[PDB]
């Protein structure tokens, strides 16, 4: 392919599973570490990532992954990281439900000049149900109307943010002018959801304005992200399904008189490098093993609930239960049933793998950057969103399959520039 | 005294002036250059100030002042500075008014994750007018429901500060216990102006929670700070006025059930500090003659405005005019005829203090170190918040008027702990 691929990379504390934090490796307060938060934007950074990607929510409960209890908020950790790192970008996740788009608005563009043109919205348009209980709110609205909420918000962020022309700043001391008066615009917005008179009170950064990356995936919010967005999270559940999704969401994009090169598609991959096949399949099996095997069963019972999955001995073959029936999900119990046959699995490890599944991109550098490469060029991606939960994977990840994908011309050699736009690909709008 | 005197720096860009950026040493993008503000916050460390403080705005016009017209936004800054600062305190002014708590807590909490225990909060209850229109507003509440405001959205951030216990997290890896279930509280709050369920999903600090700072000045105001404030902010117009307000707010947290030692006193003062009288005086001279001087006899002219004082020459003394007649501001009138005749001033020079008046706090270190100890002295300030805006004079304060105090033992050789509440002399909560 004629350009780059790229990664960004999730920075994600203990990491997204229930036991993972169990591991010997794992730093059980990596969520509110900062050592840990500066060493993995490092390592991207050393990688030539062009950006870094914090998740966020709204909402907890007991039952939430302890990731999800005790953890970063991220306009405020993106803002440390800015000052500990030099190209990489700094991608965050913030609602539009809730906080008003003038706040969103000056907190992105001052990020966005402390990092000298790094900054990057995710934006979420539908939190949890509960989030709104936290925010004053008896529910949150319907999945239409948090779209229609979704893009007056961006649309008053984006207006702001050009509030001032990017040649405002005269600064001229002779004459007293600091400002030309021609070049400052106010939004005067008065729309349904939001009312913003403008102007803001931050000027143009050094990429014009922040980037905007979304995770539509209903037929909505795949047309919205087409609509609005420059980069594009999806899953990478198979090749097949990310093609699709690929092909759909640059389709659309084509529709909104886009050029689809504009909107880069990034799939998310938890990659388990290490130097010989057995050696990444025992890093999988260590954290695969240290789900509570009763709770794995319980889970997996979902799936052949007309038998009591504790009277089969844990270490014996996956039981020929199954039959038909018929449940919402019936063709998950028959791959379960099928992959259980074809590698001779026991009830526990059909349990562990199905509490922790073992991703495709497993196994030697080479295997990994060859199905990168294979993806890439069979248009499912544009570049990937790199997960480490993990330890060691990332260090891997950046160690070993980077260098093959720069040998093989696929990756640049040094950073293009020092700004998330120029990193991607992008043009700067002013 | 027994306590130490404490600083604050406050850092603002191109400063509070109009026309203080034409200056030859001011760099004009200072309020948008990261370069600026950490060099500040490093020259305040050395001087081992217990803290720095950005204040805020939410709403411009073209008359704006240019430090507001294009400014950093706190939380992002503070964080950015977290990381290249070690125990300096990092305070920020953000307002009740629009934000839900909710993302206030978490946002200062997260910061004072980073920080090490470092954040604190000016809380601002009165933004002006226009910014309602800037968060989907028509107007401000009036005076007193924005203090009734305030009350709830401080005690429901508070409370989500409390979600969790200081040892809730107990990360037991052999038995997966991450944390203790019974050291989890949900605040359950519905008030008239928020609901907000809870938890917080992110637990105690180093410090236990940020500070909060407020600078109520009214009835109401005073009042509200001395119930809720750690530290107040005031003005150092006179020292018999500051005495006054002093004693009244350190009445006021007594009847509230406080120990008025827990809430510390910060009049705002900016320094002018040079080796001898008059090169601190040629320094203010250079600033004061910065306004364009058609400006400030207008500006002048509003409390003489039974003359014209175009008729008069600049450079010849100012005009025995003024009578009595009645102005809402004619005490002021008289200071300045009494002042212009002690003087022996020009109506250039008149027009010029009135537009940017001259400080107690100027001249030789050991004058301007001797002003303060007599203010603490006095039970005027338990510390000041030190503005800096005419280039050098944090870096001279620092150098040269911190050793005078250290060495009468008035203050810390070193800093007495890494958070704010130890630097401040405050308890931790919990």
Redesign the interface.
Known sequence: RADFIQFGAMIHGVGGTT?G????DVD??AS?N?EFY?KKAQTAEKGLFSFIFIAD????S?K?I?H??????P??????????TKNIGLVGTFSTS???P??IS??L???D??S?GRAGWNLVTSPQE?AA??????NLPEHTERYEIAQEHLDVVRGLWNS?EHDA?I?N?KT?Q??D?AK?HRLNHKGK???????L???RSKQGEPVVFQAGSSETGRQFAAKNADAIFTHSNSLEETKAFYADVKSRAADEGRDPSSVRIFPGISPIVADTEEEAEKKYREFAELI?IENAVTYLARFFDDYDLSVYPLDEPFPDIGDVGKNAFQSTTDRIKREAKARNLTLREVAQEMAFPRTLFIGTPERVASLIETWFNAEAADGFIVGSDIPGTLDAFVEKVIPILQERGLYRQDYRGGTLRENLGLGIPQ
Request: a positive charge; zero cysteines; aromatic letters at 16%.
């Open positions: 036991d934090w169990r591991h010997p059980p307060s509110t900062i500066m929510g709204l909402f907890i007991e939430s302890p999800f209890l005790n953890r970063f908020e306009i405020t950790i993106l803002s440390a990281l800015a000052s500990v809730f906080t008003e003038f706040t000056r907190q563009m001052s990020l000049h402390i000298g509960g209980r936290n925010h004053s709110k008896s001032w700043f600064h001391k007293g600091f400002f008066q400052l959801y939001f009312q913003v008179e403008g102007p009170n931050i000027g509570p």
